Amino acid sequence: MERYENLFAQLNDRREGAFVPFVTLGDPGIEQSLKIIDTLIDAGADALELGVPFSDPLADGPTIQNANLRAFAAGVTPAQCFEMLALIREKHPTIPIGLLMYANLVFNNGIDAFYARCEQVGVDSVLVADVPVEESAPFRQAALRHNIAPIFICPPNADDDLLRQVASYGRGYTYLLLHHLIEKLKEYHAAPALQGFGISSPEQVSAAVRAGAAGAISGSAIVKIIEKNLASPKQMLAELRSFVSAMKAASRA
Amino acid sequence: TTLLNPYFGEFGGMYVPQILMPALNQLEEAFVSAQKDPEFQAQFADLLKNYAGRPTALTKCQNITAGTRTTLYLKREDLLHGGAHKTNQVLGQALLAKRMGKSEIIAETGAGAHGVASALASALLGLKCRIYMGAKDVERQSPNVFRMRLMGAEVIPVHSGSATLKDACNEALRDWSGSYETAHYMLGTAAGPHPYPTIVREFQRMIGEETKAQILDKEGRLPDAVIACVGGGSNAIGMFADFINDTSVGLIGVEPGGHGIETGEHGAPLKHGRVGIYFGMKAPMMQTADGQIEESYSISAGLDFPSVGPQHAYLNSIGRADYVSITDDEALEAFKTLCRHEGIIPALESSHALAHALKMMREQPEKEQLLVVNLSGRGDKDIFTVHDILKARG
Ligand SMILES: C=C(/N=C/c1c(COP(=O)(O)O)cnc(C)c1O)C(=O)O
Ligand SMILES: c1ccc2[nH]cnc2c1
Ligand SMILES: c1ccc2[nH]cnc2c1
Ligand SMILES: c1ccc2[nH]cnc2c1
Ligand SMILES: [Cl-]
Ligand SMILES: [Cl-]
Ligand SMILES: [Cl-]
Ligand SMILES: [Cs+]
Ligand SMILES: [Cs+]
C-alpha cells in the first residue's frame, strides 16, 4: 500500500503537520489497549507507532519498560499483537500503522515470515530499535518485498554518510532523534521527517513543523497518561482524548 | 564501515541503536591504534606484571590423576590480583578509556568478580566507576558489593525485568548512549557488539600464551586439550586464542548444565539454545518459542547467562572447538576434590572446567592425555554457597 505517501500528500494539501502517538500493544490489557488506540484515532492521531512487548527492551526508558511489564502481566504475546493489529486495520483502513520492534522478535520465526505477517495484517512500517543502518540489509530487503516501509532513526550525533544512508534506505518517514538535518535530508530525497525527541507539549509540535519536519511523534507522554490513570479507565480515555486533541490542533498551525 | 571484521562467520555484529554506533566506532579505532603502540603495550605489561602479578603459575596436579595416564595442569588465574582472570582485560580497557580521554567507567556484574576488577582498576587509574548489578545479584553478593564500594565505586542495583545480569547488561548499555563522550562501558566478557568480543579476547590472550610457554618448558610439547568454563566466553577465549592455529590442540568449552539440560534450568545456549539477536550480537540464546529471552540457571552466578560470545559459536560451527556441559552436582564434586587433594579452593565457575577434565580422565583412565584446565578464579566467594548445600544434603 501507500498509506504514508497518501497521508503526507493530504497533510501537505492542508498545510498541516502529522501528530503520531506511540503506545505499547496490550498495555494495560488487550481490550483496554484496543479502546485506548480507538480513542487516539478518534481524537485526531494521523498515524500510530505501536510497540510489541519484549523481554529485554534495551532502547526504552522506564516509562515504556513499565508499559511492557503491564502487557506481560496480562499475558500479551507477539501472536496476540498480530491479532490486535488485524482488528485495528479492519476498523481503520487509511491510518498508517508503524511497529516498534526489537530485532529478536523479527528474526525469531524468520525475517521474511515476520514481514509477510506484517503485510497480511496491514502494517505500513517497522522500526527495529537495535538494527542500525550498518546491519539493516536483510531487514530492509524483507520489508520492501512485503510493501513495509523500513524506518530509520537519524540521531543528533549523525554525520553526512549516515544522512545519505538513512535518505536512501528509509521509506515512509525518517525518525528524527543545528536542525539543518531537515534540509540535507530533503536534499538527499529522504522520506518525510517526523521529530520524536521527547515531544510532550503542543508548542513542540508547532516547532517541529516550523523547522520543516512533516510532523511529530509523542509516545512516552501517551504511556504516562496510561500509567497515571490505571485505576480510572474512563478518566484515562478523557485525558488521552484531551492530550491528542491539543497536540493535533498544534499541527494545523 | 569498520576497521576490523565484526563477524565470526554468521555470529557477532553490532546490533545496537544507531545512537551507540559512534561510541563503538571510536572504541574500535582506539583499540586498533593501541595495538600498534609500543607505549600502550608497555604500560599494559607493567600493570599486568607489577600490579596484577603476571605471569600466573601453571600447577601440575599429581594427587588428583594418580593411577591414570592423565597429566593435569591448572593455569592459576585464581592467583591474579582480585582472584579471577577478569582483572587482565579490565586493566587493558581502563587504559583504552584513558587513551580516548574518558574519565568515567560503567560496568555490569553478576557474581561480582568483574565489578570488583572494574572498581580496583578505576581506583588505580583515577577513573570514576559505576557498576550495574541485578538487585537480585546485589542482595546475594553483599561481600563483592562492599568491596566495590570500599574501592570508591558506585553500585547501582537494577529493578528492571528479572533484575539480574542480563538486566544489569541491559542497564549498562542504557546508560552509555548518553555518557559515551565522557564514560567508557567496561563490558566484562567476550560478547556484546563488536568490537568487544575482539578486544576482550586480545586483552585475555596472555592466558594461553603463558600456558603454551609453560607447558613447552615443563613437558616439551603442546597439550592434547585446554579446557575452560564458558559464561560469556572471556576466560575460555583467553586460553584458546594462542592455540587456535595449533590444530593438534583440543579446545573444550564447558557450559553450565544447572539441574540438568533436560530440566531446562541450565546456562548452555551454545549446545541447547538457538541463534537470536540480543545484547548487541547475533549469537546462540536461551529463548522461548516466541523469541522472548529466557532466564538461565547455574549454581555458579558467573556462568548464569542465557547467551555466549560469537567467537565460541563460530569455533563450534567449524568444529575447531568442542562444547560440553557440567551439572551443579558435577561442579560441586570437582570443587570438593580439588580442595581435598590439591589444597586449592576453586571458583564454582572454574570447577565446571575441572569437572569435565576429571570426566575425561575417569572415563578413559588408560588414555594418555596432557590436559590444562583454566582455573579462572578462586572460590573464597563460594564457601557460604557450598556450606549451605552440604548442610542441606547432610
Ligand atoms: C559474570 C561474572 N563472572 C564470570 C566468571 C566466569 C565466566 O565468565 P567468562 O565466560 O567471561 O570467563 C568464569 N570464572 C570466573 C571466576 C568468573 O567470575 C562477573 O564477575 O560478573
Ligand atoms: C517509539 C517508542 C520506543 C522506541 N525505542 C526506540 N525508538 C522508539 C520509538
Ligand atoms: C567485514 C570483513 C572484514 C573487514 N575488515 C574491515 N571491515 C570489515 C568488514
Ligand atoms: C557473561 C555475561 C556478562 C558478563 N560480565 C562479566 N562476566 C560475564 C559473563
Ligand atoms: Cl505541511
Ligand atoms: Cl527514500
Ligand atoms: Cl614464540
Ligand atoms: Cs598420572
Ligand atoms: Cs552461559
XYZ file of C-alpha atoms and ligand atoms in Angstrom:
700
model
C 0.000 0.000 0.000
C 0.977 3.759 0.056
C -0.582 4.938 3.389
C 2.299 7.272 4.486
C 2.585 8.873 0.959
C -1.222 9.422 0.839
C -1.259 10.866 4.398
C 1.658 13.308 3.721
C 0.094 14.347 0.344
C -3.241 15.053 2.156
C -1.442 16.903 5.018
C 0.736 18.943 2.558
C -2.566 19.958 0.789
C -3.887 21.125 4.255
C -0.502 22.863 5.122
C -0.680 20.574 8.163
C 1.789 18.605 10.341
C 1.300 14.953 11.369
C 0.828 14.083 15.066
C 1.703 10.397 15.744
C 1.288 8.846 19.221
C 3.315 5.823 20.464
C 1.618 3.174 22.688
C 2.570 -0.379 23.773
C 0.186 -3.067 22.358
C -1.706 -4.786 25.223
C -0.864 -2.070 27.862
C -2.611 -2.365 30.271
C -4.536 -5.294 28.648
C -5.763 -6.408 25.146
C -9.350 -4.997 25.437
C -8.251 -1.682 27.143
C -5.359 -1.314 24.589
C -7.884 -1.595 21.660
C -10.105 1.073 23.407
C -7.027 3.318 24.043
C -5.969 3.062 20.352
C -9.554 3.796 19.028
C -9.546 6.894 21.399
C -6.200 8.190 19.946
C -7.588 7.847 16.351
C -10.983 9.390 17.228
C -9.112 12.315 18.957
C -7.079 13.019 15.761
C -3.948 10.789 15.603
C -2.679 10.972 11.956
C -0.716 7.703 12.364
C 0.187 5.159 15.107
C 3.512 3.819 16.437
C 2.797 0.513 18.272
C 5.320 -1.361 20.463
C 5.325 -5.162 20.713
C 6.147 -6.271 24.313
C 9.718 -7.691 24.527
C 11.516 -9.338 27.496
C 14.624 -7.057 27.274
C 13.668 -3.666 25.740
C 17.207 -2.145 25.994
C 16.270 1.037 23.939
C 13.360 2.078 26.226
C 13.441 4.344 29.299
C 11.455 3.327 32.429
C 8.019 4.681 31.268
C 7.969 2.121 28.370
C 9.831 -0.652 30.343
C 6.830 -0.478 32.755
C 4.342 -0.486 29.799
C 5.872 -3.837 28.591
C 5.705 -5.405 32.094
C 1.995 -4.370 32.333
C 1.383 -6.135 28.959
C 3.330 -9.342 30.028
C 1.316 -9.256 33.322
C -1.772 -9.603 31.006
C -0.097 -12.489 29.054
C 0.364 -10.398 25.857
C 2.313 -12.403 23.201
C 3.554 -11.465 19.712
C 0.752 -13.629 18.140
C -1.862 -11.717 20.206
C -0.247 -8.445 18.963
C -0.715 -9.555 15.268
C -4.409 -10.422 16.006
C -4.797 -6.912 17.561
C -3.133 -5.255 14.526
C -5.514 -7.066 12.095
C -8.512 -5.815 14.176
C -7.158 -2.206 14.255
C -6.606 -2.200 10.450
C -10.133 -3.703 9.877
C -11.634 -0.685 11.799
C -9.279 1.955 10.341
C -8.412 1.471 6.645
C -6.202 4.536 5.941
C -4.294 5.382 9.173
C -0.605 4.494 8.794
C 0.387 1.835 11.387
C 4.036 1.524 12.380
C 5.562 -1.086 14.700
C 8.466 -0.535 17.057
C 10.241 -3.918 17.220
C 13.332 -5.468 18.775
C 15.460 -7.482 16.361
C 14.986 -10.862 18.084
C 11.134 -10.760 17.601
C 11.697 -10.029 13.862
C 14.426 -12.702 13.462
C 12.725 -15.344 15.719
C 10.367 -17.073 13.205
C 12.417 -15.912 10.127
C 12.766 -12.275 8.942
C 10.814 -12.831 5.664
C 7.985 -14.547 7.608
C 7.787 -11.614 10.093
C 7.383 -9.017 7.296
C 4.908 -11.308 5.415
C 2.726 -11.394 8.585
C 3.020 -7.556 8.895
C 1.755 -7.212 5.285
C -1.135 -9.717 5.919
C -2.465 -7.680 8.944
C -1.932 -4.318 7.092
C 1.067 -2.776 8.969
C 2.759 0.080 6.995
C 6.191 0.364 8.627
C 8.655 -1.292 11.040
C 11.347 0.436 13.129
C 13.746 -2.196 14.541
C 15.248 -0.359 17.540
C 18.539 -2.369 17.736
C 19.310 -2.686 13.975
C 21.491 0.246 12.838
C 21.769 1.075 9.062
C 25.077 -0.909 9.075
C 23.206 -4.166 9.973
C 19.939 -3.338 8.155
C 20.225 -5.012 4.702
C 18.243 -8.258 5.310
C 15.571 -6.375 7.306
C 15.133 -3.511 4.770
C 15.025 -6.063 1.853
C 12.395 -8.256 3.551
C 10.387 -5.106 4.499
C 10.317 -3.779 0.897
C 9.477 -7.245 -0.535
C 6.308 -7.172 1.643
C 5.321 -3.483 0.971
C 6.528 -2.463 4.501
C 8.485 0.808 4.989
C 11.748 0.265 6.946
C 12.074 3.228 9.394
C 15.491 4.569 10.465
C 16.477 6.879 13.322
C 18.558 9.903 12.361
C 20.247 10.642 15.723
C 21.569 14.057 16.810
C 25.175 12.567 16.664
C 24.512 11.818 12.875
C 27.176 12.722 10.172
C 26.835 13.175 6.318
C 27.406 9.451 5.333
C 24.648 8.491 7.854
C 22.290 11.162 6.381
C 22.877 9.771 2.805
C 22.307 6.165 4.086
C 19.093 6.985 6.028
C 17.844 9.022 2.984
C 18.490 6.065 0.563
C 17.406 3.147 2.838
C 14.378 4.520 4.714
C 10.794 4.778 3.474
C 7.514 6.130 4.825
C 9.139 8.606 7.240
C 12.563 9.437 8.792
C 12.577 9.212 12.632
C 14.466 12.335 13.798
C 16.278 11.832 17.170
C 21.537 22.888 14.139
C 18.366 21.130 12.757
C 19.625 21.808 9.142
C 19.499 17.961 9.289
C 15.997 18.545 7.782
C 17.326 20.479 4.699
C 20.122 17.866 3.972
C 17.546 15.027 4.349
C 15.300 16.871 1.826
C 18.370 17.472 -0.432
C 19.014 13.652 -0.335
C 15.236 12.979 -1.090
C 14.729 11.219 2.303
C 11.262 10.106 3.463
C 9.460 12.986 5.254
C 10.915 13.714 8.738
C 8.962 13.176 11.970
C 10.603 14.699 15.107
C 10.425 12.226 18.043
C 12.761 13.682 20.788
C 10.586 13.971 23.971
C 7.574 15.615 22.188
C 5.232 16.242 25.200
C 3.671 19.763 24.602
C 1.697 21.441 21.756
C 4.488 24.075 21.260
C 6.981 21.261 20.394
C 4.621 20.025 17.579
C 4.302 23.607 16.132
C 8.120 23.987 16.436
C 8.832 20.654 14.634
C 6.618 21.759 11.649
C 8.202 25.282 11.582
C 11.686 23.551 11.397
C 10.487 21.809 8.167
C 9.522 18.430 9.736
C 6.344 16.755 8.329
C 5.147 16.274 11.936
C 5.975 14.907 15.398
C 5.889 11.570 17.330
C 4.988 11.634 21.059
C 4.914 8.147 22.574
C 6.121 8.427 26.219
C 3.658 11.272 27.002
C 0.765 8.916 25.970
C 2.087 5.924 28.065
C 2.490 8.337 31.034
C -1.291 9.193 30.882
C -1.970 5.376 30.900
C 0.416 4.806 33.892
C -1.217 7.685 35.908
C -4.861 6.572 35.321
C -4.626 2.731 35.681
C -7.323 2.890 38.459
C -9.725 5.010 36.267
C -10.282 3.659 32.713
C -12.814 6.419 31.742
C -10.550 9.268 33.161
C -7.660 7.624 31.200
C -9.661 7.914 27.928
C -10.785 11.503 28.763
C -7.137 12.621 29.428
C -5.854 10.741 26.283
C -8.600 12.403 24.129
C -7.754 15.902 25.540
C -3.963 15.396 25.052
C -4.241 14.166 21.409
C -6.835 16.904 20.529
C -4.328 19.538 21.863
C -1.271 18.016 20.102
C -3.188 17.639 16.772
C -4.567 21.258 16.989
C -0.887 22.421 17.268
C -0.073 20.785 13.853
C -2.729 22.710 11.765
C -0.670 25.788 12.711
C 32.073 0.861 7.927
C 34.605 -0.771 10.371
C 38.400 -1.295 10.564
C 38.017 -4.954 11.643
C 35.524 -7.729 10.752
C 32.582 -7.524 13.240
C 31.567 -11.161 12.491
C 32.910 -14.635 13.203
C 31.151 -16.408 10.308
C 27.447 -15.585 10.791
C 27.875 -14.690 14.509
C 28.510 -11.276 16.147
C 27.797 -7.899 14.537
C 26.791 -4.524 16.039
C 23.043 -4.800 16.862
C 22.755 -1.529 18.814
C 20.553 1.559 18.374
C 22.071 3.954 15.774
C 22.993 6.419 18.618
C 25.604 3.946 20.038
C 27.366 3.308 16.685
C 29.796 6.272 17.042
C 30.818 5.022 20.533
C 31.587 1.556 19.081
C 33.477 3.017 16.068
C 35.522 5.293 18.413
C 36.389 2.287 20.633
C 37.422 0.144 17.618
C 39.792 2.875 16.249
C 41.311 3.433 19.757
C 41.885 -0.333 20.090
C 43.464 -0.690 16.589
C 45.702 2.341 17.440
C 46.649 0.969 20.893
C 47.576 -2.488 19.483
C 50.185 -0.765 17.194
C 51.503 1.495 20.045
C 54.541 0.079 21.910
C 53.973 2.621 24.761
C 50.391 1.319 25.289
C 51.669 -2.293 25.230
C 54.472 -1.396 27.718
C 52.034 0.316 30.159
C 49.628 -2.692 29.902
C 52.501 -5.174 30.526
C 53.692 -3.064 33.547
C 50.240 -3.200 35.148
C 49.826 -6.925 34.390
C 53.260 -7.751 35.898
C 53.755 -5.345 38.796
C 50.114 -4.722 39.870
C 48.205 -7.914 38.920
C 51.160 -10.372 39.437
C 51.548 -11.983 35.959
C 52.757 -14.429 34.891
C 50.444 -16.757 36.814
C 51.658 -20.230 37.830
C 50.955 -23.428 35.890
C 50.415 -26.079 38.603
C 50.841 -29.822 37.982
C 48.093 -31.759 39.878
C 49.698 -35.134 40.714
C 47.338 -36.386 43.503
C 44.086 -35.969 41.523
C 45.378 -38.040 38.486
C 47.154 -40.833 40.483
C 46.706 -44.267 38.843
C 45.619 -42.861 35.424
C 47.541 -41.841 32.265
C 46.167 -38.243 32.555
C 48.660 -35.453 33.335
C 46.713 -32.357 34.510
C 47.981 -28.780 34.840
C 45.922 -25.879 36.239
C 46.507 -22.362 34.839
C 46.367 -20.340 38.087
C 44.233 -17.260 37.167
C 42.943 -17.721 40.773
C 46.311 -16.149 41.879
C 45.780 -12.943 39.860
C 45.106 -9.736 41.892
C 41.323 -9.749 42.581
C 41.156 -13.585 42.461
C 39.940 -14.046 38.856
C 41.058 -13.672 35.194
C 38.633 -10.658 34.892
C 41.486 -8.391 36.112
C 43.528 -8.852 32.904
C 41.144 -7.221 30.420
C 39.790 -4.573 32.857
C 43.382 -3.173 33.002
C 43.541 -3.035 29.155
C 40.051 -1.495 28.809
C 40.813 1.104 31.573
C 43.950 2.119 29.598
C 41.824 2.356 26.384
C 39.328 4.605 28.270
C 42.267 6.882 29.224
C 43.634 6.772 25.578
C 40.191 8.041 24.391
C 40.351 10.832 27.029
C 37.452 9.291 29.080
C 37.249 9.997 32.883
C 34.319 7.630 33.814
C 33.711 3.799 33.695
C 30.357 1.853 33.526
C 30.410 -1.951 34.221
C 27.907 -4.820 34.661
C 28.481 -7.753 37.041
C 26.525 -10.773 38.201
C 28.813 -12.768 40.551
C 30.778 -9.586 41.339
C 34.276 -10.582 40.062
C 34.137 -8.239 37.007
C 32.614 -5.473 39.197
C 35.449 -5.847 41.797
C 38.018 -5.883 38.888
C 36.406 -2.728 37.345
C 36.377 -0.933 40.722
C 40.048 -1.865 41.529
C 41.237 -0.763 38.052
C 39.256 2.501 38.329
C 40.762 3.221 41.827
C 44.310 2.597 40.491
C 43.949 4.628 37.277
C 41.849 7.601 38.584
C 38.555 6.830 36.769
C 35.087 7.387 38.369
C 33.342 3.941 38.281
C 29.619 2.888 38.431
C 28.580 -0.821 38.456
C 25.117 -2.049 37.370
C 24.154 -5.287 39.156
C 20.900 -7.291 39.428
C 19.067 -6.140 42.608
C 18.662 -9.958 42.973
C 22.522 -10.095 42.479
C 23.227 -7.153 44.915
C 21.117 -8.925 47.607
C 23.086 -12.244 47.083
C 26.614 -10.674 46.654
C 26.872 -8.181 49.600
C 30.594 -9.119 50.038
C 31.618 -8.204 46.434
C 29.261 -5.120 46.650
C 31.030 -3.902 49.844
C 34.479 -4.429 48.183
C 33.367 -2.335 45.130
C 32.169 0.499 47.480
C 35.409 0.268 49.610
C 37.314 0.894 46.330
C 35.153 4.053 45.759
C 32.800 2.608 43.057
C 29.044 3.407 42.867
C 26.988 0.140 42.846
C 23.525 0.650 41.139
C 21.031 -2.214 41.772
C 18.601 -2.966 38.850
C 14.788 -3.315 39.471
C 14.143 -3.743 35.655
C 12.862 -7.166 34.383
C 14.273 -10.321 36.112
C 16.582 -7.800 37.961
C 19.710 -9.860 37.073
C 22.934 -9.979 34.922
C 21.079 -9.690 31.555
C 19.105 -6.676 33.040
C 22.438 -5.428 34.548
C 23.811 -5.844 30.965
C 20.565 -4.134 29.768
C 21.108 -1.216 32.305
C 24.788 -0.599 31.309
C 24.042 -0.090 27.532
C 21.020 2.102 28.545
C 23.478 4.458 30.422
C 26.363 4.551 27.817
C 24.105 6.009 24.962
C 24.179 9.422 26.734
C 27.586 9.378 28.535
C 29.980 7.939 25.867
C 31.704 11.327 25.265
C 32.807 11.137 28.991
C 32.324 7.417 30.015
C 33.648 4.088 28.698
C 31.443 0.966 29.007
C 33.763 -1.753 30.510
C 31.941 -4.903 29.208
C 33.157 -7.889 31.293
C 33.093 -10.778 28.769
C 33.889 -11.707 25.135
C 30.336 -10.921 23.993
C 28.170 -7.948 23.073
C 28.547 -5.799 19.946
C 31.796 -5.507 18.001
C 34.420 -4.554 18.974
C 34.028 -6.054 22.477
C 34.424 -9.793 21.593
C 37.675 -8.943 19.765
C 39.051 -6.537 22.443
C 38.282 -8.860 25.361
C 39.988 -11.802 23.549
C 43.121 -9.753 22.817
C 43.246 -8.436 26.421
C 42.895 -12.059 27.790
C 45.187 -13.878 25.275
C 48.187 -13.805 27.678
C 46.477 -16.719 29.494
C 47.025 -19.061 26.516
C 50.357 -17.515 25.509
C 51.810 -18.121 29.006
C 50.198 -21.609 29.173
C 51.868 -22.551 25.831
C 55.331 -21.309 27.001
C 54.956 -23.009 30.396
C 53.769 -26.404 29.012
C 56.622 -26.359 26.396
C 59.109 -25.650 29.227
C 57.687 -28.382 31.537
C 56.604 -31.131 29.029
C 58.431 -30.232 25.748
C 55.157 -30.392 23.761
C 51.733 -28.795 23.369
C 48.783 -30.011 25.432
C 46.328 -32.558 24.000
C 43.483 -30.220 25.153
C 42.841 -26.990 27.062
C 39.536 -26.829 28.979
C 37.718 -23.724 30.237
C 34.266 -22.821 31.602
C 32.064 -20.599 29.383
C 29.816 -17.946 30.914
C 30.099 -15.278 28.210
C 33.409 -16.620 26.880
C 36.320 -14.409 28.101
C 38.465 -16.835 30.149
C 37.920 -19.605 27.576
C 38.821 -17.439 24.535
C 41.810 -16.077 26.512
C 43.092 -19.609 26.990
C 42.092 -20.776 23.445
C 43.375 -17.883 21.282
C 47.107 -18.727 21.049
C 46.286 -22.423 20.354
C 43.670 -21.882 17.559
C 46.328 -22.374 14.821
C 47.872 -25.413 16.672
C 45.405 -27.852 15.065
C 46.562 -30.814 17.330
C 45.377 -28.962 20.473
C 41.803 -29.656 21.559
C 39.752 -26.619 22.656
C 36.974 -27.634 25.106
C 34.465 -25.141 26.478
C 32.225 -26.123 29.411
C 28.772 -24.524 29.731
C 26.750 -24.872 32.934
C 24.205 -27.705 32.905
C 22.462 -26.430 36.067
C 19.950 -29.025 37.316
C 20.344 -30.922 34.013
C 19.815 -29.954 30.351
C 16.547 -31.961 30.308
C 15.128 -29.732 33.175
C 15.557 -26.541 31.062
C 17.267 -24.972 34.152
C 20.788 -24.534 32.699
C 23.003 -21.938 31.045
C 24.057 -23.862 27.932
C 22.767 -21.845 24.923
C 25.648 -22.777 22.600
C 24.628 -26.504 22.557
C 20.973 -26.234 23.770
C 19.724 -22.747 22.739
C 19.152 -21.255 19.298
C 20.512 -18.285 17.452
C 18.935 -14.902 18.191
C 19.776 -11.198 18.314
C 20.242 -9.638 21.768
C 22.866 -7.712 23.764
C 24.198 -6.227 20.501
C 25.098 -9.560 18.873
C 23.768 -12.441 16.769
C 24.573 -15.496 18.908
C 23.059 -18.597 20.493
C 20.372 -17.586 23.074
C 18.142 -19.380 25.550
C 14.810 -18.101 24.277
C 11.109 -19.010 24.316
C 9.413 -20.359 21.139
C 8.065 -16.715 20.763
C 11.605 -15.213 20.864
C 11.497 -13.759 24.418
C 14.939 -14.145 26.102
C 14.774 -16.992 28.689
C 16.214 -16.911 32.204
C 19.281 -19.176 32.545
C 20.287 -21.077 35.728
C 23.549 -22.293 37.328
C 24.736 -22.888 40.916
C 27.598 -20.573 39.753
C 26.498 -16.909 39.378
C 29.422 -16.254 36.984
C 28.056 -18.786 34.419
C 24.356 -17.904 34.815
C 23.834 -16.128 31.435
C 21.460 -17.124 28.578
C 23.922 -16.297 25.718
C 27.582 -16.779 24.666
C 30.289 -14.848 22.807
C 30.108 -15.112 18.997
C 33.693 -16.416 18.509
C 32.714 -19.576 20.554
C 29.610 -20.051 18.338
C 31.915 -19.784 15.281
C 34.664 -22.100 16.601
C 31.925 -24.645 17.395
C 30.302 -24.349 13.929
C 33.564 -25.146 12.046
C 34.471 -27.920 14.546
C 37.638 -26.224 15.828
C 36.331 -26.180 19.443
C 34.007 -28.623 21.214
C 31.465 -27.563 23.838
C 30.074 -29.720 26.637
C 28.067 -29.156 29.831
C 28.610 -29.978 33.509
C 25.818 -30.011 36.074
C 25.739 -28.295 39.515
C 26.371 -31.685 41.220
C 29.407 -32.435 38.959
C 30.843 -28.939 39.582
C 30.404 -29.345 43.393
C 32.211 -32.732 43.355
C 35.154 -31.224 41.400
C 35.239 -28.281 43.924
C 35.478 -30.709 46.904
C 38.057 -32.948 45.085
C 40.454 -30.062 44.313
C 40.222 -28.654 47.907
C 40.925 -32.099 49.480
C 43.577 -33.478 47.074
C 45.461 -30.327 45.891
C 44.826 -27.674 48.628
C 43.306 -25.241 46.057
C 39.779 -23.775 46.586
C 38.489 -23.152 43.013
C 35.674 -20.795 41.900
C 32.478 -22.816 41.228
C 32.707 -21.376 37.656
C 36.219 -22.929 37.205
C 35.006 -26.137 38.958
C 32.851 -26.777 35.812
C 36.042 -26.951 33.699
C 37.788 -29.154 36.275
C 34.753 -31.480 36.465
C 34.918 -32.086 32.696
C 38.707 -32.817 32.880
C 38.010 -35.294 35.742
C 35.364 -36.958 33.489
C 37.884 -37.190 30.582
C 40.331 -38.914 32.985
C 37.917 -41.188 34.852
C 36.011 -42.382 31.720
C 39.263 -43.475 29.958
C 41.895 -43.859 32.704
C 44.427 -45.678 30.460
C 44.223 -42.959 27.748
C 47.479 -40.971 27.692
C 46.460 -37.282 27.730
C 48.094 -33.972 28.698
C 45.335 -31.577 29.796
C 45.265 -27.990 31.012
C 42.304 -26.586 32.930
C 41.938 -22.807 33.112
C 41.376 -22.155 36.839
C 39.618 -18.864 36.113
C 39.157 -17.848 39.791
C 39.476 -18.729 43.480
C 36.462 -19.983 45.416
C 36.589 -17.907 48.655
C 33.400 -16.140 47.305
C 31.631 -19.598 47.043
C 32.284 -21.086 50.561
C 28.912 -19.749 52.003
C 27.071 -21.259 48.953
C 28.884 -24.662 49.261
C 28.417 -24.650 53.105
C 24.638 -24.045 52.554
C 24.311 -27.050 50.113
C 26.417 -29.512 52.235
C 24.196 -28.683 55.316
C 21.033 -29.377 53.188
C 22.167 -32.829 51.828
C 23.890 -33.809 55.175
C 29.819 -12.835 35.270
C 30.949 -12.688 36.091
N 31.863 -13.712 36.286
C 32.177 -14.601 35.415
C 33.253 -15.595 35.631
C 33.449 -16.613 34.683
C 32.633 -16.703 33.422
O 32.872 -15.548 32.549
P 33.740 -15.743 31.213
O 32.986 -16.774 30.398
O 33.641 -14.387 30.582
O 35.162 -16.136 31.519
C 34.454 -17.519 34.906
N 35.238 -17.529 36.000
C 35.089 -16.604 36.931
C 35.982 -16.710 38.119
C 34.076 -15.599 36.790
O 33.950 -14.658 37.756
C 31.189 -11.471 36.819
O 32.139 -11.464 37.586
O 30.415 -10.536 36.686
C 8.973 4.738 19.962
C 8.934 4.043 21.171
C 10.047 3.400 21.664
C 11.227 3.494 20.938
N 12.505 2.963 21.182
C 13.237 3.376 20.164
N 12.556 4.115 19.275
C 11.260 4.213 19.739
C 10.138 4.855 19.235
C 33.942 -7.200 7.088
C 35.017 -8.071 6.921
C 36.315 -7.662 7.101
C 36.526 -6.338 7.446
N 37.704 -5.642 7.669
C 37.311 -4.426 7.942
N 35.984 -4.265 7.928
C 35.444 -5.476 7.603
C 34.129 -5.886 7.442
C 28.729 -13.346 30.925
C 27.991 -12.195 30.632
C 28.349 -10.966 31.138
C 29.452 -10.929 31.977
N 30.053 -9.895 32.651
C 31.099 -10.419 33.296
N 31.237 -11.715 33.115
C 30.201 -12.068 32.268
C 29.847 -13.303 31.729
Cl 2.975 20.770 5.641
Cl 13.627 7.391 0.335
Cl 57.474 -17.802 20.473
Cs 49.114 -39.514 36.315
Cs 26.364 -19.245 29.559
